[PDB]
Ligand binder design. Structure first.
Ligand SMILES: [Fe+2]
Ligand SMILES: [Fe+2]
Ligand SMILES: [Fe+2]
Lengths: 136, 515, 168, 390, 390, 75, 136
């Protein structure tokens, strides 16, 4: 839940309290994360996908999803993976919408992201190393 | 036959053609990359984004139409171009032109990687990046082009491809986002460009900055930079695929963590202090402490989701991370001292932190007031903003023993007597030439690889010359030919001219003469 | 020292006058090799024209290249170094030198010297880049082997610098 | 709510907008609003194409035309510079001189190609609905089109890959753009040939759109033996980025490529009732002429007449031309044997027709390229050299 | 300054923005955000095409499907209503049922055509640079193409003008859109034929691109006598807007039009070395298939199966078909005499080739149109009727 | 350009809910009422296209027929 | 000059003063005007055309031009005619610009407006009645 918030953990502390944890010796090495981060540019299409796909059936299948308003974009962090089927977004929008149209406003991915068929997947999985990529 | 056929309407979708792409390469003994490398890229690597040329153009042109409609129709009608806070409109002179060289050189870097790869799909992944980085060059140019037309100070927005040559901050940008991209082992270049520069640092530089832009009135940069990064994520995949392609190469276990730590330090050396400086000192309204932004995007999310997850395949946490974290807290405040002290060499107008900026700095960086703030307030009292004051703070630093040195490797300035960030001065003489190095990682690079790091620094080039003559020769003046582009304040009156600089009698020293 | 302007100064005007007096491919080849041995790389003999040598070098290359097309048969332009040697023979020779290298300090010197002597227009572009790429591959493999093994104090002595200052 | 502050927009928040307005001066601080006003225009006034492209490359003054100074900050092991004059034999007083006559920066380039992308799909849905493939000679379709037109994608693909080192090594922004756009069009051509083959596989059951036989023909058929050798040489045999561009587009693709695409596959499509293939060669041929305009400007208009290096540059251009033209002539002599496998149509695939098609390709090349660089060529002698394989 | 106040923008002025924000409620006042949510979707979910198109026409309930009530506010002198059931013989339970299967509202329609507009110009600049016209048989070019292809624009132009009364009279929004888009494509076809002729006039000195001879041939050549009579009848002889649409596209253009464009001018372009004309017929043929999809939906899918009026509607459709098919067959019998003026190519312009082309046109029409309305037709009998003029 | 301003820029700005309530209500009437004007002008212009004898005048009316479809969809 | 201002003449009066002139018997018939009115939608291209073509060489050849800021559009009134050469605007903008591109943001015309070659003319002349229209 709240461990995927933008201001989770050390990000809540201020002043000397933040510095003490920032410079704590356990925090001088990276810590493996199972999370993925997805950034979506705000746009008519994206705003509909956010409310009717990500925040409904998306969070229903992945309750770890946090979505935050960053003025010009949506910041999304979740455990494991996030999936957006462009065919479903097309039905929501009432207009042709391929996975490549979806990518018009997908602004960033911290994770392994790939296009397969109508689906856009961002996943913590090491695609190509632990799980092979395929064709249609 | 000539009468029978199925007449159902069919086309050929992009992924149908992409399936046959791997078979486009054929074998001959000369088919090998032209560039020096310690690695061998596996011929079976596949790419994450199934893109063919026709669909590439369709996807990118649709991004463009919307972006250019917002800019040329909507935001222009709204007069958005002149509703930016002055400090931020000045900051975008630097951010967008400096990023422009990154976009430009990444064209060449990605073509080198396209050459390195043997797999037709991996080549295609790099090829798509080559085209994207052309797109982004033009996008960065378009931002400054737009600002030139509509913002109240076009100077510097309109001529930075030559006025950036005057100052020392440009040199460090050329290392991380120009030469670091294209001069080295293709794999080292790729970790510099894609795994670190793009997958790690373009998030703060291009995504996170848009919230700062918006906070300061700038809806031009979000419109463009957010579209830029939609291509950037496919480049992140390119960097990951590089790793994928060399994972079964025994040379990877020999070499990768060294190239990776070198690239991570290379990139962070410049971007950690410079982005922090541009974000916190180049704005009025601040979003969050830069060290918090760094923590979220660099340390926890990039480090955990990219580096930490790759530990299964022999990728180590960067040895230089501990030193990078100290830079995240303090190095941008260190750089601000250099940037404000040497303002006449820039091409943007700066503003000292006002009283409420200063309270913000102290609250989020306890100890900032007693160190940096006292210095800024003293400089203000001495006439920092006042053109008739005869006061340029670089000479104040020299008068008080606070010499500025340029790292031979990173080109980043260093004031050891004031710096709270990582580093210490090392001065070596070698073959009749002195060299100032500033940190353990850069010194090792120069010691092992002196012939990669012969960059002339601004003191070497300008030694003995008077400030105003260097600025005049560099065309760092407005269209009247007398008024500086750069300014120490963001007001519309009392601008410094060449005569105002010359009255300060500031001549460039050789910082290494005392040694 | 007090520097002259960046792009137009007496140092460059002086060297362009010397470059103008070159009249044969033989004379220009030795001139460019002498200049590059004298003023380029960290093992250069002189840092006196540090801020000017790269532009002067460009001006020497232009002269030698034009003399090449004026004075040498076409087949020569593709297959021979201006020293008279066979380009492919130059290639084979210097790759063999670098793979015979014992240390990174031997290998680094061979590569730098190869570029000092045979940089275009002395060697044909295609032969040069192919060789420089092969030399670079070997130099990296040696240098990047146990990159963090030797401590800085050690590396400083191995390099041979005079340590003028180390901050405490 | 959410964990972090929801940032107020300076453009629309009343407080911040009022603050920003109090800080914006009531007058402009300079009147020069033309972005990079100092670029020398090639045409009457500065174009946006020049404004967004020119001097993006941060060359120092020791690379002809550069505005910057000093050495690169980081170079290769051994000292190879990021960019350097050692990259090519050719010389010029200014590497920024080149101008694409079609003035393509990124947006117009993808805008145009996106029209072709979408329209092509619309054309393919209608053609499948027309059943127009019914009138295609099955032998041309299954034997010349599927096998020998399919094998030509490998020539286009090799030409595309020849640009990889060009894109890294070449020495200015407008040149890089010209090169990269030419490379994408070439890989577009190869993908479009595979797209046509995949289309026919949907309309003709048992039609094998796999690249196996095309790849086998490309690599072991004597009809493509000489073409494959040239492309492998142009791609991987050299790194002078001017040599690659000149050899690839101005010699090989302008002689072998133009004959194969336009005189064989397009021209003979309109003798054997092929209403589909000319839709695709219309694109490749359009790409070839757009690319030719920029190649012409770079090599013919500029480098061959550079005030200080023109004659110098023509020496290399003339040398390159003699070698690669000799390779392309061999490639065409191998290729005209394909005419032994097609129905003899007078003035088309008889000796008279192939002779006059070669007279078109070599004659046009003389007017487009050879005459303007001072390269002396006997067209007739080259025609009879190629027909030697007829 | 200026004479009138410079208005402050409520979006960005601090004062007015603060005032507006104080008036905007903190919650939505309804949750139904789907524009015209009550439209019955034809597909899985509502499409934008339906949302922006459906029920724009303000029909009252006494025109099948209308949601409004009452008489029109102003009618013709004598009482003819703005729209009325007296406009057509056909009947339906809902005039809004029709759906263009390509879902074209205005934006996608001009977006697609704009791609063709710009690409066509790019293709023409390259073709002129290729000199590809050199391989065009001069007789086909100057005698069949200039004169007889040019005269066909008049058929397209008449079909276009047949839609004028359709655009005024027809009874729903999606139908109107379908009709108007079909009309523009037809006048596009005529302008594109004239564009091709004007292009050739630029490449061939002495080539007369004037419409004088084409117009003379259209109006007095017996080869077009029957085509001109049908088009003049379809255009100005009737006003039932369903009759015009059905007769124009589903009978005349689907038989005479398809044979003339695809079996003659396009097909014989790829026997006489014409690499230019198929670029233009690619567009007309694409337009024909897009138009056919919407015509099919309106007449075949809907009106012929309307739950209450299908058999009623097929009675008129079958009657219209017998008359206009008989006219189109006569038009084709006049037209095949053109084959006396072209070189006899086996399986193409001999009796066997023309016979099998007609078997394509009439066979496809049987499958596309006749079988689905219950119209019984002997294909063979129609082929021999047309060849009677060969 | 129009759809870029609307679907990209103004949406990102949240412009749709920054209208004074009275005016956002007024646009319910103005744009839908104007919509019928746009729609019927399609039919009117086709009638005028029919009335004219000059091919150019027909063309002038024909362009309006298409424009009024555009405007229906715009409203 | 000021007779072409938006608020010229009766438009300056308020209250009873405006009504008295509005209902003056001489103002119950139309009065012939030699003016033309041109409305240009604000856009990057248009704003450059306004300042560098209309307000410089435009007002130099026709000093009767008044240009007023109407927030979303430019209101332009002039005596006789206004001409805008799209070829000149193209050189100003540095990009291809036909007369049809100019028309993208030409929003309204009170007057006789027509396209000839690269030129867009709005004129008080009764085109087609007093002066015939031509081809290129
Ligand atoms: Fe980029
Ligand atoms: Fe990138
Ligand atoms: Fe309208």
């Amino acid at each position: 839940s709240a461990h995927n918030a933008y201001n989770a953990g050390i990000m809540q502390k201020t002043g000397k309290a933040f510095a003490d944890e920032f410079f704590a010796e356990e925090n001088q090495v990276v810590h493996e994360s199972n999370a993925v981060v997805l950034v979506l540019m705000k746009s008519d299409e994206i705003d509909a996908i956010i409310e009717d796909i990500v925040l409904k059936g998306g969070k229903a299948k992945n309750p770890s999803i946090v979505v935050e308003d960053k003025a010009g974009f949506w910041w999304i962090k979740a455990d494991g993976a996030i999936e957006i089927d462009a065919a479903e977004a097309g039905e929501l929008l009432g207009k042709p919408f391929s996975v490549y149209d979806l990518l018009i406003n997908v602004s960033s991915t911290v994770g392994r992201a790939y296009t397969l068929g109508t689906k856009f997947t961002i996943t913590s999985e090491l695609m190509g190393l632990d799980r092979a990529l395929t064709d249609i | 036959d000539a009468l029978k056929v199925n007449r159902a309407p069919v086309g050929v979708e992009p992924q149908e053609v992409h399936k046959w792409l791997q078979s486009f390469n054929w074998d001959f003994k000369e088919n090998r990359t032209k560039y020096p490398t310690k690695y061998h890229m596996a011929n079976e690597t596949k790419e994450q984004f199934k893109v063919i040329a026709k669909e590439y153009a369709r996807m990118e042109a649709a991004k463009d139409e919307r972006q250019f409609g917002t800019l040329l129709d909507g935001l222009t009608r709204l007069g958005a171009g002149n509703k930016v806070h002055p400090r931020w409109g000045e900051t975008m002179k630097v951010i967008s032109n400096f990023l422009e060289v990154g976009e430009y050189n990444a064209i060449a870097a990605s073509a080198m990687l396209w050459d390195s790869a043997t797999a037709a799909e991996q080549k295609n992944g790099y090829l798509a990046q080559v085209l994207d980085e052309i797109r982004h060059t033009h996008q960065c140019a378009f931002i400054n082009h737009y600002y030139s037309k509509h913002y109240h100070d076009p100077a510097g927005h309109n001529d930075a491809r030559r006025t950036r040559a005057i100052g020392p901050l440009w040199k460090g940008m050329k290392r991380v986002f120009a030469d670091g991209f294209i001069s080295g082992d293709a794999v080292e270049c790729s970790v510099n460009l894609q795994l670190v520069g793009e997958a790690c640092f373009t998030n703060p530089l291009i995504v996170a900055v848009t919230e700062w832009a918006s906070a300061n009135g700038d809806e031009i940069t979000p419109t463009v930079f957010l579209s830029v990064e939609t291509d950037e994520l496919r480049h992140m995949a390119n960097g990951y695929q590089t790793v994928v392609s060399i994972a079964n190469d025994p040379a990877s276990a020999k070499f990768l963590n060294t190239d990776l730590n070198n690239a991570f330090w290379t990139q962070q050396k410049y971007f950690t202090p410079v982005l922090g400086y541009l974000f916190e000192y180049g704005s009025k309204f601040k979003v969050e402490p830069w060290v918090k932004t760094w923590n979220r995007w660099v340390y926890e999310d990039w480090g955990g989701i990219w580096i930490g997850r790759l530990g299964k395949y022999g990728v180590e946490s960067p040895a230089s991370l501990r030193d990078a974290k100290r830079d995240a807290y303090w190095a941008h405040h260190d750089l601000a001292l250099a940037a404000y002290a040497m303002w006449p060499l820039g091409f943007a107008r700066l503003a000292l932190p006002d009283e409420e900026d200063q309270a913000w700095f102290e609250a989020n960086y306890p100890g900032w007031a007693d160190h940096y703030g006292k210095i800024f307030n003293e400089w203000k009292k001495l006439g920092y903003e006042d053109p008739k004051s005869g006061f340029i703070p670089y000479q104040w630093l020299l008068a008080n023993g606070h010499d500025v040195y340029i790292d031979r490797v990173s080109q980043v300035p260093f004031i050891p007597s004031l710096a709270k960030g990582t580093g210490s001065l090392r001065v070596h003489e070698f073959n009749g030439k002195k060299h100032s190095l500033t940190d353990d990682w850069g010194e090792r690079q120069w010691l092992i690889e002196p012939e990669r790091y012969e960059c002339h620094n601004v003191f070497e080039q300008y030694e003995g010359r008077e400030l105003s003559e260097v600025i005049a020769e560099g065309h760092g003046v407005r269209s009247d030919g007398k008024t500086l582009i750069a300014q120490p304040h963001t007001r519309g009156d009392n601008l410094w001219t060449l005569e105002d600089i010359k009255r300060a009698g500031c001549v460039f020293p050789d910082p290494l003469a005392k040694f | 020292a007090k520097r002259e302007p960046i792009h137009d100064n007496s140092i460059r005007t002086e060297w362009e006058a010397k470059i103008a007096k070159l009249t044969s491919v033989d004379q220009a080849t030795k001139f460019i090799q002498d200049f590059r041995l004298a003023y380029t790389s960290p093992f250069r003999k002189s840092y006196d024209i540090d801020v000017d040598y790269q532009y002067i070098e460009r001006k020497i290359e232009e002269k030698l290249s034009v003399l090449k097309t004026e004075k040498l048969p076409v087949a020569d332009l593709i297959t021979k170094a201006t020293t008279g040697e066979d380009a492919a023979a130059v290639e084979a020779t210097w790759i063999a030198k670098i793979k015979a290298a014992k240390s990174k300090y031997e290998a680094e010197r061979i590569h730098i010297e190869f570029r000092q002597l045979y940089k275009p227009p002395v060697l044909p572009v295609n032969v040069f880049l192919r060789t420089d790429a092969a030399l670079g591959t070997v130099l990296m493999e040696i240098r990047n082997t146990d990159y963090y093994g030797t401590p800085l104090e050690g590396l400083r002595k191995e390099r041979g610098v005079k340590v003028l200052h180390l901050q405490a | 709510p959410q964990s972090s502050q929801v940032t107020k927009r300076g453009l629309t928040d009343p407080e911040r907008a009022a603050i920003i307005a109090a800080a914006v001066p009531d007058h402009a601080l300079d009147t020069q609003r033309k972005y990079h006003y100092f670029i020398q225009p090639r045409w009457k006034r500065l174009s946006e194409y020049e404004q967004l492209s020119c001097y993006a490359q941060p060359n120092p003054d020791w690379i002809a035309g550069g505005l910057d100074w000093g050495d690169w900050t980081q170079k290769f092991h051994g000292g190879r510079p990021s960019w350097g004059n050692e990259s090519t034999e050719l010389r010029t007083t200014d590497w920024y001189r080149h101008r694409d006559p079609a003035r393509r920066w990124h947006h117009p380039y993808v805008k145009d190609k996106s029209e072709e992308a979408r329209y092509t799909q619309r054309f393919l849905a209608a053609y499948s609905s027309e059943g127009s493939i019914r009138t295609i000679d099955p032998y041309w379709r299954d034997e010349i089109l599927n096998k020998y037109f399919g094998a030509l994608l490998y020539s286009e693909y090799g030409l595309f890959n020849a640009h990889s080192s060009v894109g890294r090594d070449c020495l200015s922004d407008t040149i890089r753009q010209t090169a990269v756009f030419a490379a994408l069009d070439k890989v577009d051509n190869a993908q479009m040939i595979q797209m046509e083959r995949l289309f026919i596989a949907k309309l003709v059951p048992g039609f094998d759109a796999s690249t196996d036989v095309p790849k086998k023909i490309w690599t072991t058929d004597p009809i493509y033996s000489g073409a494959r050798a040239t492309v492998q040489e142009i791609w991987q045999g050299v790194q002078d980025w001017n040599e690659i561009l000149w050899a690839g587009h101005a010699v090989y693709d302008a002689t072998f490529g133009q004959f194969a695409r336009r005189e064989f596959f397009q021209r003979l499509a309109t003798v054997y009732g092929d209403t589909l293939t000319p839709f695709f060669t219309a694109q490749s041929q359009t790409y070839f002429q757009t690319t030719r305009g920029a190649i012409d400007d770079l090599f013919v208009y500029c480098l061959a007449n550079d005030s200080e290096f023109g004659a110098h540059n023509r020496t290399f251009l003339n040398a390159w031309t003699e070698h690669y033209l000799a390779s392309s002539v061999a490639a065409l002599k191998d290729f005209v044997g394909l005419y032994a496998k097609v129905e003899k149509v007078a003035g088309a695939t008889d000796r008279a027709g192939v002779s006059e098609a070669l007279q078109r390709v070599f004659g046009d090349w003389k007017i487009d390229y050879a005459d303007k660089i001072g390269f002396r060529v006997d067209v007739d002698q080259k025609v009879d050299a190629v027909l030697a394989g007829y």
